[PDB]
Design an enzyme around this catalytic site. Structure first.
Site, PDB file in Angstrom:
ATOM      1  N   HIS A   1     -57.620  34.212  79.657  1.00 32.67           N
ATOM      2  CA  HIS A   1     -57.708  35.664  79.597  1.00 32.67           C
ATOM      3  C   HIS A   1     -59.038  36.141  79.033  1.00 32.67           C
ATOM      4  O   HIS A   1     -59.310  37.330  79.006  1.00 32.67           O
ATOM      5  CB  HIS A   1     -56.510  36.310  78.839  1.00 32.67           C
ATOM      6  CG  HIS A   1     -56.542  36.149  77.345  1.00 32.67           C
ATOM      7  ND1 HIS A   1     -55.863  35.145  76.687  1.00 32.67           N
ATOM      8  CD2 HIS A   1     -57.157  36.881  76.381  1.00 32.67           C
ATOM      9  CE1 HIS A   1     -56.060  35.260  75.384  1.00 32.67           C
ATOM     10  NE2 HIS A   1     -56.843  36.308  75.172  1.00 32.67           N
TER      11      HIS A   1
ATOM     12  N   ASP B   1     -52.741  29.487  79.946  1.00 33.23           N
ATOM     13  CA  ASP B   1     -53.851  30.306  79.469  1.00 33.23           C
ATOM     14  C   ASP B   1     -54.964  29.413  78.927  1.00 33.23           C
ATOM     15  O   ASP B   1     -55.132  29.265  77.708  1.00 33.23           O
ATOM     16  CB  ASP B   1     -53.340  31.269  78.390  1.00 33.23           C
ATOM     17  CG  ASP B   1     -54.375  32.308  77.998  1.00 33.23           C
ATOM     18  OD1 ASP B   1     -55.376  32.468  78.713  1.00 33.23           O
ATOM     19  OD2 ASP B   1     -54.181  32.980  76.976  1.00 33.23           O
TER      20      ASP B   1
ATOM     21  N   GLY C   1     -59.912  39.216  68.855  1.00 31.09           N
ATOM     22  CA  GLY C   1     -61.248  38.692  68.665  1.00 31.09           C
ATOM     23  C   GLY C   1     -61.215  37.182  68.406  1.00 31.09           C
ATOM     24  O   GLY C   1     -62.243  36.496  68.514  1.00 31.09           O
TER      25      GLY C   1
ATOM     26  N   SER D   1     -59.003  35.184  70.073  1.00 31.49           N
ATOM     27  CA  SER D   1     -58.591  34.549  71.335  1.00 31.49           C
ATOM     28  C   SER D   1     -59.585  33.508  71.857  1.00 31.49           C
ATOM     29  O   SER D   1     -60.795  33.732  71.819  1.00 31.49           O
ATOM     30  CB  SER D   1     -58.425  35.598  72.442  1.00 31.49           C
ATOM     31  OG  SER D   1     -57.126  36.126  72.450  1.00 31.49           O
ATOM     32  N   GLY D   2     -59.066  32.393  72.372  1.00 31.97           N
ATOM     33  CA  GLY D   2     -59.925  31.357  72.926  1.00 31.97           C
ATOM     34  C   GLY D   2     -60.355  30.341  71.894  1.00 31.97           C
ATOM     35  O   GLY D   2     -60.773  29.224  72.232  1.00 31.97           O
TER      36      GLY D   2
END
Ligand SMILES: [Ca+2]
Lengths: 10, 223
Positions: B40, B84, B175, B177-178
């Site tokens: 995402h 994801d 912020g 995420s990932g």
């Protein structure tokens, strides 16, 4: 619920 | 990261910031030319920033490298967030050293109760908005599947796990995420989603990396 990105995707 | 602490400059050498004129997601360096992040977080024009601590000031040790290509998992579903995960190839290899290093992929999945380190530049407030300049860290345990499914009935697939604290106050947030979830020196998770941040009975949900080791390796090998 939202993803934790900037900006969030809910 | 809500309720965490200042990591310390370059103490999380595999942590990267994905930037498009501003920080929008984190990621993990898995070798000199590849970063793992969340699907995402995909967008064109990504610049990968390695060796960062204060993302608003050039202090030394930073390496800015353009993404050559981003590979979102073919089965990523934006509605459920299943699968994801995304791989980013760097335009040129990063220089690895003490301040910039890769993190190992897991050989087996982690079990409930395992303590992990989550890091990022996301929001530090469960209520309101406050982005930090420096990298924040949080130690959090992986929760049992039963507690995870009870918190988010019908929304947890076998490719996700929950980690955090049911009492609230400590969590990853917008912020982050990932970013990496590292346990025992292995990348076990990727910051994905949650209901709000640091809310009671609403732990963070993470992409379960051990289910993708094969896909990651085959994909990297053919690109
Ligand atoms: Ca910097």
């Amino acid at each position: 619920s939202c993803t934790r990105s900037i900006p969030p995707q809910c | 990261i809500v309720g965490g602490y200042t990591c310390g400059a370059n103490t999380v050498p595999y942590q990267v910031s994905l930037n498009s004129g501003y920080h929008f997601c984190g990621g993990s360096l898995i070798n000199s030319q590849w970063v793992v992040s969340a699907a995402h977080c995909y967008k064109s024009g990504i610049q990968v920033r390695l060796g960062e601590d204060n993302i608003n000031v050039v202090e030394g040790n930073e390496q800015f490298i353009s993404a050559s290509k981003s590979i979102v998992h073919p089965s990523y579903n934006s509605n459920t967030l299943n699968n994801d995960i995304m791989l980013i190839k760097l335009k040129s290899a990063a220089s690895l050293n003490s301040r910039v290093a890769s993190i190992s992929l897991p050989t087996s999945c982690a079990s409930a109760g395992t303590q992990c380190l989550i890091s990022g530049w996301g929001n530090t407030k469960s209520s309101g908005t406050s982005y930090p300049d420096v990298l924040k860290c949080l130690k959090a345990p992986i929760l049992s599947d039963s507690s995870c499914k009870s918190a988010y009935p019908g929304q947890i697939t076998s490719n996700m796990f929950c980690a955090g604290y049911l009492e609230g106050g400590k969590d990853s947030c917008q912020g982050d995420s990932g970013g990496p979830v590292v346990c025992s020196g292995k990348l076990q998770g990727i910051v994905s989603w949650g209901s709000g941040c640091a809310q009671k009975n609403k732990p963070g949900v993470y992409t379960k990396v051990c289910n993708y080791v094969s896909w990651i390796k085959q994909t990297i090998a053919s690109n």
